[PDB]
Amino acid sequence: MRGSAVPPTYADLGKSARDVFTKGYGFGLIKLDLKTKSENGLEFTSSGSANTETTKVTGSLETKYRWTEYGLTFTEKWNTDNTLGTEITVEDQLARGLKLTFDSSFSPNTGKKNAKIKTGYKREHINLGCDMDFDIAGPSIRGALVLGYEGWLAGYQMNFETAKSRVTQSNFAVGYKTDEFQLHTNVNDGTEFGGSIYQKVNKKLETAVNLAWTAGNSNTRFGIAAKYQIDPDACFSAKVNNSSLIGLGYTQTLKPGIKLTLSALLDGKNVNAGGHKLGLGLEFQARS
């Protein structure tokens, strides 16, 4: 097939991860997420998470607004406890161009109130972000020099913090994009080696493999993932790690707007190391 010639930095990092997250809603925690909407142009999103199985009860409900086809889009992701913030999306036009965003991200109480301006300009074979975090005391400056090329790609990330200190922790990675495949290698800052590889030979059959080598002389952790986009509204997972993780994701769809996803992890029968805990996912939707 083909696709495009852009993709930012979170590329293969997120396409395989979303592919890695498919392992149900968390390894062990219930999250009934209900999505709504209104024709008046007002999008909605109510949610109720129960992380750590029962080691924490949290509720998170947000509001989304879409303004004009050319205008902008405001995301008021409020909360219940908790914290808040907002988003102002800037688009030049359908023809991509540059797209600026504003974060009203802040700290409710006992927190460090700090928003920021996430920038980003794209085009043919390239796209760099100007993500700026103007936080408390010392502001942080993010960057990214992603480079395009005919079925070839090379990325570069720089992270600035504090006004006195110029550099903090910047990583650089490489790899090229391919017709339905994605291969890259991440080189985290601080001396770290690692990479990932997506392989899609079928729409009903999907695969991927991750792994990273830690400098020094350290051992090695593996990662074998795979999902079969089963014809019926129900796909699963092959979440098997060679490092020491043996779990599996089971995604399930139950027609209209309601979907139930269940997954679990089994690390043998450890006592002081780990055991077997399951995760639950619920999805209540609507029309309105």
UniProtKB/Swiss-Prot annotation:
Membrane topology: Multi-pass membrane protein
Principal location listed in the UniProt entry: mitochondrion
The record's account of how the chain is modified after translation: Phosphorylation at Ser-196 by NEK1 promotes the closed conformational state preventing excessive mitochondrial membrane permeability and subsequent apoptotic cell death after injury. Phosphorylation by the AKT-GSK3B axis stabilizes the protein probably by preventing ubiquitin-mediated proteasomal degradation. Ubiquitinated. Undergoes monoubiquitination and polyubiquitination by PRKN; monoubiquitination at Lys-277 inhibits apoptosis, whereas polyubiquitination leads to its degradation and promotes mitophagy. Deubiquitinated by USP30.
GO MF: ATP binding; ceramide binding; cholesterol binding; identical protein binding; oxysterol binding; phosphatidylcholine binding; porin activity; protein kinase binding
Glycyl lysine isopeptide (Lys-Gly) (interchain with G-Cter in ubiquitin) cross-link site: K15, K23, K56, K64, K112, K113, K164, K269, K277
Keyword Ubl conjugation listed: yes
Phosphoserine: residues carrying this PTM: S16, S196, S243
Residue stretches spanning the membrane: 29-38, 42-50, 57-67, 72-79, 83-92, 98-107, 114-123, 126-133, 140-148, 153-161, 166-178, 181-188, 192-201, 205-214, 221-230, 234-241, 245-254, 257-266, 276-285
Sorted UniProt keywords: Acetylation, Apoptosis, ATP-binding, Cell membrane, Host-virus interaction, Ion transport, Isopeptide bond, Lipid transport, Lipid-binding, Membrane, Mitochondrion, Mitochondrion outer membrane, NAD, Nucleotide-binding, Phosphoprotein, Porin, Transmembrane, Transmembrane beta strand, Transport, Ubl conjugation
Residues bearing PTM N-acetylalanine: A5
Impact noted for substituting E76Q: Abolishes ceramide and phosphatidylcholine binding
GO CC annotation: extracellular exosome; membrane; membrane raft; mitochondrial membrane; mitochondrial nucleoid; mitochondrial outer membrane; mitochondrial permeability transition pore complex; mitochondrion
Residue positions where Phosphothreonine is found in the record: T22, T110
GO biological process, one term: negative regulation of apoptotic process
Domain of life: Eukaryota
Keyword Thylakoid applies: no
Regulation: Inhibited by nitric oxide.
PANTHER family noted in UniProt: VOLTAGE-DEPENDENT ANION-SELECTIVE CHANNEL (PTHR11743), VOLTAGE-DEPENDENT ANION-SELECTIVE CHANNEL PROTEIN 1 (PTHR11743:SF13)
Family listed: Belongs to the eukaryotic mitochondrial porin family.
Subunit structure: Homodimer and homotrimer; in response to cyclic AMP or calcium; oligomerization is required for scramblase activity. Component of the mitochondrial permeability transition pore complex (mPTPC), at least composed of SPG7, VDAC1 and PPIF. Interacts with SPG7, NIPSNAP2 and SLC25A30. Interacts with hexokinases including HK1. The HK1-VDAC1 complex interacts with ATF2. Interacts with BCL2L1. Interacts with BAK1. Interacts with RTL10/BOP (via BH3 domain). Interacts with amyloid-beta and APP; induces VDAC1 dephosphorylation. Interacts with TMEM41B. Interacts with BCAP31.
Description of its domains: Consists mainly of a membrane-spanning beta-barrel formed by 19 beta-strands. The helical N-terminus folds back into the pore opening and plays a role in voltage-gated channel activity.
Role: Non-selective voltage-gated ion channel that mediates the transport of anions and cations through the mitochondrion outer membrane and plasma membrane. The channel at the outer mitochondrial membrane allows diffusion of small hydrophilic molecules; in the plasma membrane it is involved in cell volume regulation and apoptosis. It adopts an open conformation at low or zero membrane potential and a closed conformation at potentials above 30-40 mV. The open state has a weak anion selectivity whereas the closed state is cation-selective.
Stated name of the protein: Non-selective voltage-gated ion channel VDAC1
Organism field: Homo sapiens (Human)
